[PDB]
Subunit: 386 residues, 4 copies
C-alpha cells in the first residue's frame, strides 16, 4: 500500500545498533514495525483466538525458582548432548517455513550462518517448507562443527517423502523431526483477514508409518508435536529416539495445553517405568527468556526450541541478528544458572523448582462493570501549582 515508504525508513538506519538489543522481545518489536503486513501476519499468527500460543508462554510464570545460595558458581557450563551430538547450548532454532518473507535475500541460509558464525554453535531445525533448498542451507553453515536437523512433513505421495529422507541423510543432517500436529492446517485468522483484498501434508500419518520410517532410515527419529503423556509413552513403546512436546507454536489446535505443563506431567510418569534414558524429550512454545529454558531443563527436557524469536532476529539483522539472539539467550541462561546455584545442565533438577502452583490456571469471573466504573481509586500526592 505505498506505505512501505515508512517501512524502508525504519529498516534503513532508524534500526537500533545490534549492540543496543537487550532481549528477545526487542527483536520482536522491531520486526513488528518493519516487515510486510503479510510476513508479520504469517510469522506472528496463531490458531483461532490464539489462547494456546499465549498460554505456551504464560505457563512458565506458573513456576517459580527455589535457588541455592553460598555455592561456588565462578564457573558454569551450559553444554549438553542432544540426539548423540555434543551441543554448546541447551536450546535450538525450531523449524520455521518460508524465511524469505522476512529475510528476502538470504532466508534460511542466514539462520545457518548465525547458528555457526560466532563462538556458540546452536542446532538448526530445517523446515520441509523452507523457502531455500536443503542443499543451499547445509552448504551455507560456516562451521563443520555446527549441527542440523531436518523437519519432515510426510507427503501423501510417499515416494516424495522416501527420496527426501534419503537426500537429507546424505547431506549430513543428524536427525529427523516428523511433524504430527498438523494433519490439517490450523486456521490462522490474521493471514485470512489481510488476504481479503492438504497434499503437502498427509492427514493419514499413523503410528504404523513411524514404525515403518524407523526401518527405512538410520537417522534418529523425533516425533514432533506430542501434546499428551499417553502419546509420549507410545513413542517409547515403538522405540523412536525422541519427542517434541509441542503444539506448533499455538498454530494448530487452540486449547492445547502449554508443553511446559505437559512436560511437568510426563517426565515423572517416564520415571515410574525406567523410560527417562530411553526417550529424549524436547519442548518448544512461548520460550522467550533464559529462565524459561531453565524451567524446562529442570523438569527434564533434553532441549528447548524457539521459533518466532529467531525468525524475528533473522528478519531485522539477518545472520548477525541470529548470532546476537543466540548470545542474548546463552548469557541469560548462564547468568541465571549462577543465581540458581548450580554449574552444569545435569544439576538442573526438579528440586530447584517450586511447582506448588503449576495448576493455578485460572479464568476470573467477569468484571463487575458498574461497581468498578463508579469506584474512584486512591490518588498520589500532587506537586504544588506554583
Amino acid at each position: 500500500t505505498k506505505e512501505d515508504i515508512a517501512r524502508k525508513e525504519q529498516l534503513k538506519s532508524l534500526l537500533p545498533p545490534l549492540d543496543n538489543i537487550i532481549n528477545l522481545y526487542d527483536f520482536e518489536y522491531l520486526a513488528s514495525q518493519t516487515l510486510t503486513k503479510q510476513a508479520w501476519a504469517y510469522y506472528s499468527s496463531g490458531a483461532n483466538d490464539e489462547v494456546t500460543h499465549r498460554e505456551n508462554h504464560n505457563a512458565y510464570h506458573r513456576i517459580f525458582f527455589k535457588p541455592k545460595i553460598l555455592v561456588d558458581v565462578r564457573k558454569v557450563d551450559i553444554s549438553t548432548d542432544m540426539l548423540g551430538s555434543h551441543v554448546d547450548v541447551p536450546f535450538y532454532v525450531s523449524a520455521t517455513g518460508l524465511c524469505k518473507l522476512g529475510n528476502p535475500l538470504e532466508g534460511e541460509k542466514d539462520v545457518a550462518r548465525g547458528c555457526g558464525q560466532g563462538v556458540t554453535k546452536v542446532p538448526q531445525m530445517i523446515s520441509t517448507a523452507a523457502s531455500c533448498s536443503p542443499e543451499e542451507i547445509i552448504e551455507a553453515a560456516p562451521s563443520d562443527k555446527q549441527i542440523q536437523w531436518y523437519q519432515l512433513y510426510v507427503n501423501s505421495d510417499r515416494k516424495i517423502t522416501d527420496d527426501l529422507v534419503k537426500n537429507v541423510e546424505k547431506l549430513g543432517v543428524k536427525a529427523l523431526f516428523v511433524t504430527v500436529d498438523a494433519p490439517s492446517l490450523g486456521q490462522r485468522e490474521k493471514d485470512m483477514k489481510l488476504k481479503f483484498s492438504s497434499k503437502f501434508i498427509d492427514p493419514s500419518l499413523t503410528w504404523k508409518d513411524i514404525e515403518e520410517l524407523k526401518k527405512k532410515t538410520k537417522l534418529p527419529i523425533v516425533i514432533k508435536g506430542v501434546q499428551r503423556t499417553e502419546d509420549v509413552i507410545k513413542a517409547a513403546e515403538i522405540g523412536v529416539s525422541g519427542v517434541v512436546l509441542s503444539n506448533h507454536g499455538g498454530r494448530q489446535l487452540d486449547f492445547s495445553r502449554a508443553p511446559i505443563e505437559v512436560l511437568a506431567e510426563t517426565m515423572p510418569i517416564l520415571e515410574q517405568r525406567n523410560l527417562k534414558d530411553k526417550l529424549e524429550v524436547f519442548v518448544d512454545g512461548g520460550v522467550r527468556r533464559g529462565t524459561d529454558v531453565l524451567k524446562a531443563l529442570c523438569l527434564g527436557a533434553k532441549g528447548v526450541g524457539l521459533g518466532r524469536p529467531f525468525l524475528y532476529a533473522n528478519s531485522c539483522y539477518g545472520r548477525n541478528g541470529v548470532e546476537k539472539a543466540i548470545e542474548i539467550l546463552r548469557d541469560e541462561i548462564e547468568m541465571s544458572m549462577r543465581l540458581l546455584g548450580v554449574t552444569s545442565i545435569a544439576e538442573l533438577k526438579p528440586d530447584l523448582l517450586d511447582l506448588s502452583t503449576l495448576k493455578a490456571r485460572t479464568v476470573g469471573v467477569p468484571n463487575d462493570v458498574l461497581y468498578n466504573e463508579v469506584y474512584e481509586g486512591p490518588t498520589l500526592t500532587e506537586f504544588e501549582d506554583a
Copy 2:
C-alpha cells in the same frame, strides 16, 4: 430512541457491509450488528440480566477446559453428524429460540433462519420461539427442505387452553419436539433495554406456577418428545429423568434471567458422571447452551456428553446483517471450526468425542482476584521496548 443516525446506520448497512465471503468467525457478525442494528434491536439482542456476569461466564467457563489431543491418528475423513431427539442431524449444534427476530431482520425475521438452516448442503435444527415475530405456520412453510428439523419452544400460559391449542397446532404443523422453557417464570431485568425506554415482571403469558406435575400432564397430551429448557442444576436433571421426559437443556436463557446462575458447561461436567453413577446414562438427552462462539466450545460440550449445543445470539447477528445467507455462513463457519479441530483432536466422529480427550483439572478455577493495589500499580513503571533511531 433513534436520531437521523438511521442514516449513519444506513450507509453502514448500505453496501459498506463487507462481502459474506470475508466473514471469518461468529464474532464478525456480532461486530457488524453492533454498528448497524437499531438501539432497541441491539439492546434486546445483546443484553443480559442485571450485571450480565452469568452471560459472560457462560462463555469464559469453556476456557477453564483444555484439550488432550491424540496424535498420529488417521484423520483423512471426519463426520460431525449425529442424532437428536430421534432425528438424524448433519451437525451437533442447533439454533436456539430467540424472540422478535424481526427487530434485526424487518422483512423476513424467523423465516430467514428457517431458510438458512435448511437451504444448503449442511442442515441445522431450528428451535422456534413462542415470542417469534413471525407465526409458526409462516416459519414452517418457509423451510426449504423436508429433511430439515424444526423444533418448537413453548412458554406455558396461565390459561392452559391457549397452551393446549398451541401444542396441538405445532404438532400438526409438523415440528419435531417441544422445548418447555422453565427458567423464566419472572422476566429477567435486562437493564440495557430499560436504559433506552427512559431517555429515548410477572405476566399471564408465562405462568409462574408451572410445576413438575404440569410437565407430567403435558406428556400425556402429545406424542412429541419433550425437553425441559432452563435446567440449572444436577438435582433437576435427575428429576427430569424420573418423570421420564426426553431431555433437558442445561441453560440459563443466555444470562438473561438469574444472574449468578453457573455456566451450563460447568453443570454439564458435574451432571453427566452422576448420570452414569445412577444408570440413567442414555435415558435423557442433555443439551447445553449459552456463550458458545467457537467449534472448540462445541467440542468440549460434546466430550462431556452433551447431545447437542445451542447458540442464540450469533445466529441473531448473522440473520440481522445478512439474512438467510448470513445464517448459512454462520452454519458453515461453525461446521468447519468443528471438523477442523476434530482432526487436530485425533477423532473422526461424534461418538468418539469422550471425556478422556479433555483436561478437566482446572474446571474449578473460577476466581475473583483481590482488588488491586491502585497506588502501587500507578507509580510502577514497566520495562519498555527499544525505540527506533530519533533520526
Copy 3:
C-alpha cells in the same frame, strides 16, 4: 473552589427523574458528580488502600446459585424477623455518621422518612455520630410501624454513654448496636489529601463492659464489627442478642476479610454447637444487589445492612431517593427469589448456593509487560471504505 457552579447545574434539573433510576450504582454515580469534594471524600472513602472495602463486594462474586426450576413461584414473601420485630424486608439502612454533608437541609431525618413513607418499611440504624439529634430522627419517621435501632460508640466518659443508652430506650429504639471495630480511627486518605489546603470513642471497650451493658439495659445488644468466628462464639458465650459480621465498610482495618466469607465460615460452626437460634447474625459490606442479599440470607444471616448506597440515594433525592433505593432493592430480591425457586426467606438455605469456589481469592503473578506489549490481538472484520 467556585466550581460548585457546575455542581448546582447538575443537581438542578440535570438530575434524571427518580423513575429513571434502575439500580443502586446509578445513585452512586450521580452522588459522585454532585456532592462537595469533602462530602464525597467522607462517604466514598475506605481505609488505607481500600482493598477490604472493595473485597467486601467482590467476595459475593465468589458464590454462585444452584436455583430450582418448575416450582410455583407466583407468590413470594420476603418479610422476616429481626431482633423480635417483624420486618417487611430482609435488609436495613446501616448507621452512617454526618448525613448533613450530602443532605444539608434534612440529613438523618430524610432516611427515617424514606424508610417509612412508602409501602415497604425498612429498619434504620441511627449513628451516635448523626448530625441530627436522636429526637429529631425518631420524631420524623412517618409511620409508627417502622423500626429504629441505635448504634453506640461507648465514650471514655461512661456517664455520657449511660445517659445516652437511657435516652434512646425511652425514645423507643428497639435495639443497641455497639460498634467495636473502631477503637482507633481508620486512616481514610481521600479525606486527608483534600484536607491539605480519640475521646468520642473508648479504645478500652472490653467484653467485661458488654457483660456490664447487658445488665443496665433491656434493649437487645448486637455487637457490631465482628471479623472472626472466634469472637462470634464469644458473643454467644456472654449472651448478647446478635452480632454484625462487619469491618465498618472497609473504613477501619484494611485486609479484614469480606463478612460474606466470614459468614460462610461461622454459621456452620454455630450449628456444631446448638447456637443457630441463640445468636442473630447480621452482615454488611459491599452489598449492592438483591442477589448479594440473597447469598447472605442463604448462608444464614438474619439480615443484611447497607450504608453508602442509601447514603448516596439520600444525598441526591433525599427521602424520595431513599424510598426508591428501598424499592429497587426489594424488587431485586423478590424477582431473584422467584428465579431461585423459593417463596419465603426461611426457604433460603445453603443448598441453593454453589460454594465450591468461595476460597478462590487470588492474586495474579505480575503481568509480563514486554510480552504483552508486543503481542497484537486478533481483530474484527472492518466495514468497507466505500
Copy 4:
C-alpha cells in the same frame, strides 16, 4: 542521558515539592522521586532484574494474606518496640542496604539516612551498603544518637584481605552486625539501566566463590553477629542454623537478581513452622525484605515470626526528595501505620503478633489467568450508568 530537562526537574524539585506534612504514605515519596530524580538515578533505584516479576511479586504476595482481628480488647496503649540481634529497637522495621545513595541525594547521601534514622523520638536501624557512596566512617560519624543501631552490609571480595580489613574496620567503627550478601555472585540484569547507557556480569569485587565454609571462617574472625542476606529457600535457612550463624534475611535483593525467586513473605510462611518442627525456634533470627510499603505488610511478616522487616526503595525515595527529614517522615508514616493497625488487630505488643491473627488459607493462590479472549471482550459492551439530562 539528561536534556535541559534538568530544568523541568529543577522547577519540580524547586519549591514545587509539597510540604513534608502533606505526605500521607510511602507511595507519595515514590511518586515525587519518579518526577524529580535524574534518569540514571531513577533507573538505578527503581529497577529490577529482567521482566521485574519477582520485584512486584514481593509486594503482591502480602495481599494473599488477610487478617483475623480480635475485637473488644483493651488497645488504649500499644508498643511496637522489639529486639534485633541483641539490641533494643524502637520499631520492628529497618532500612536495608542500598548502594549509591548520592545519585538521589548528591550532597549527603547515606549520611542523611543515618541522620533520619537516629535524630527523632523514633529510631530505626540502618544497614550500610558496601556500595555506599559515602564512607563507613562518614556515615557512622553522621549518626546523631548513641542509642541508634547501625549495621554493616558486606560483599566478600575475591581478595579476602580486603574483606578482612573491612570487617576489622567496621567492627572498630562500632557497627552492630554483619549482613553478608549471598544472592548476588553474578550481577542481576537491570534492563532499565542498560536502556539508558545505549541511547543516552562477574566481578572480583563480589566473589562468586563464596561458600558455606567461608561463612564459618568469617565467624571466627569477628565477635559481631552475622546474618546471611539473600536466603531464598527453607533448605538454606536450616543450613544457616547448622553453621550457627545469628540470622538470615529471606530476601531476593528487591527483585534485582534472580527473576522468579519467590516472595520472601511466602518463604517466611513455609520456613517458620519448619523451624518449630525441628526445635530451631529461636536459634536463628529471621528477617524479611522486599515489596514492603504498608504497616499491615510489616504486621503480616511479624505474625509469621520475622524478627524484623526491611525496606529499600521507599527510604531511597524519601531521602532523595527530602533528605534527612524525609527519612524521618517515612519512619513516622510506617510507625503510625503499624501502631494503628495493631489496635485494630487487637494486640498491644510485638510478641502478641502470632500466626493465629492471620488468615493464611489463600497464601498459595498465586495464579496466571488463561489469556483473554480478545475478540469476545472487544465486541462485548458493558452496562452503563445513568446520564445527567442532555440539558
